[PDB]
Design a protein around this nucleic acid. Structure first.
Lengths: 65, 75
RNA sequence: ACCCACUCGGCACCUUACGAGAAAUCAAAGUCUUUGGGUUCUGGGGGGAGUAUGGUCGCAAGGCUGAAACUUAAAGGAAUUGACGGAAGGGCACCACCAGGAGUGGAGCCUGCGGCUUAAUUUGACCAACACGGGGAAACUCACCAGGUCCAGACACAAUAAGGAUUGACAGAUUGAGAGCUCUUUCUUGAUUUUGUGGGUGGUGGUGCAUGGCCGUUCUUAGUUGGUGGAGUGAUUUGUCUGCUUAAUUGCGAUAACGAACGAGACCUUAACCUACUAAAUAGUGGUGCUAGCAUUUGCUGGUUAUCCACUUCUUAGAGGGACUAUCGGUUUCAAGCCGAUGGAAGUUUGAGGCAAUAACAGGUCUGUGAUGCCCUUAGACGUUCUGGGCCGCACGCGCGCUACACUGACGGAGCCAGCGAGUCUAACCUUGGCCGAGAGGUCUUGGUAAUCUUGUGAAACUCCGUCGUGCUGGGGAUAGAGCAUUGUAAUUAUUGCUCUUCAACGAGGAAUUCCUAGUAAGCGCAAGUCAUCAGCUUGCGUUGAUUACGUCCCUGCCCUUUGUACACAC
């Protein structure tokens, strides 16, 4: 999927050894939370804001002015 | 693809080697008992030939050798 | 007779092993390296071989007893993972089938492959090779063949060398050649070279079974893997599962596992909706708006931000919205889901793609590479160039295709509508218009570096009217003759186009066998790639648009589970 194009970078290098050629492939997945371009998280990652629910009150009141 | 030995139906052809003429320029000048020098060959009428190009003598032509021009005796 | 509670003796059974075992398993197969209750019989790797011979019993068949020579590195046991099964169970796939459609295999031709031939007819590849190598080759490409040039022999050393190491050349011979290739007489040049030895350099030379990278396939399926814990001496196993559900290892759940990761999904691109936003002379529309044309109660038009004023429905593209199976009904054991209707642009994952795990294959490629190891060659070169030929050759066999067998048609006239593209000054690219020509084409200009021009790409099937009239016929257009053009240095072994003439097989194609479930099959053309010319090829695009089935496991295969195995190079 597209997060490969977003967060994966790869590179391939040929290595000249005395017996032949060795292929090297490096694949790095950076942390989505960093960087300042594009998306900051994976498509399926969901975060829920904590409600910060308070206690209920019993006496109606008015703060007039 | 398998290669075979290369046979030739014609004999080998030897490459040209430069002809070695020892002290060629002496036969291009003459001096008398006094000392005056003169040339034994004419020169190229073309300006970019050289005043000492010494047109060669052949059977029925004069050959430059640098300009590759051919002149004649009767002009 | 039955019931309850005991008891001795017996056939057994269930659970668990404290114990034992190589394990399977075992209540004895335990009380066995902590090794001794009593006793009988049997074995000493596999074969030869329960054979030969002798004895003995038997009517016989044969029984009992029973070698050696020789040969051999395993044979064998119990389990584990896989693979396989004309084994079982549950799912699934038009590269399977069913119901069908369109065919192919039959004809001619085009093209690739083998074979044959040849100087060579270069070569790789044999579901997952065979219009494939983007492989539509006149030269080039090119790797093959007949010949001819050059060094593009770095660098070092030795040798030669300004008393010239070396370079080139007019003309003739020679040569396919106006290659001074090499000669025949002689000029030029001047340490740049030449000779030898080391060393390099190049190679479409070999090896893809030495390699990298890429690609294909296994496998279009749903599969895969740590940590910690549990089981096992162990290989290994569980997690990763009975059931239901899903396209899905997708979920509901169940649970010696818990929590995770990859893959699937999510994602991205594209197609369909938006009378809602922001606009636009490179997109359009309206204005008895301006000007003018034709026909008469006003319709159709021509120039319109460059001859104006408005607007964004259509077109464009940024930002967004929109579907989440929504609502309702039914059904499942609540649940995950599934079915139907309604509403909706859209209710198969909304359609189609892109991306895509682990482990592999001696799969393909050394002929994409200044990616490359090793081997071979390296000046009479397998390097690099030039000319010519070949790759296309033809008793024959095969694969992908094109054109057809006609009246649901051929021909003629008329009607007359797309979408995806591409295009030149780093020069001759896309070409409107005018003229000539029967055509193909030629010629003078023109616009376009492009939502601007080609171009509304006025495409073709298609529609109407007419001729033909069931006759291999005006179906079909192979083969062949003559001429005229274009591209290119070169068209012969016909590059292609055009004109006239000849008018073959073929009357729907045996055994067989391919693809496909909706804007899909099929018919029809168009643009791009290739490209100087050549498209019967491919990659896309639109125009017209069915039948049949919403299924099954019969065939061919795929996934999971159980089971058997003497397979593991894995039927």
């Amino acid at each position: 999927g597209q997060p490969v194009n977003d967060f994966i970078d790869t590179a391939t290098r040929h290595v000249l050894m005395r017996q032949g050629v060795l292929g090297i492939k490096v694949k790095i997945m950076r942390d989505p939370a960093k960087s300042r371009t594009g998306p900051k998280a994976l498509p399926d990652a969901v975060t829920i804001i904590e409600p910060k629910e308070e206690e209920p009150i019993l006496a109606p009141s008015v703060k007039d002015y | 693809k398998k290669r075979k030995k290369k046979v030739y139906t014609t004999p080998k052809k030897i490459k040209h080697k430069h002809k070695k003429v020892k002290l060629a320029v002496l036969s291009y000048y003459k001096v008398d008992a006094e000392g005056k020098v003169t040339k034994l060959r004419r020169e190229c009428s073309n300006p970019t030939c050289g005043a000492g190009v010494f047109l060669a003598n052949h059977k029925d032509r004069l050959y430059c050798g640098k300009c590759h021009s051919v002149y004649k005796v009767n002009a």
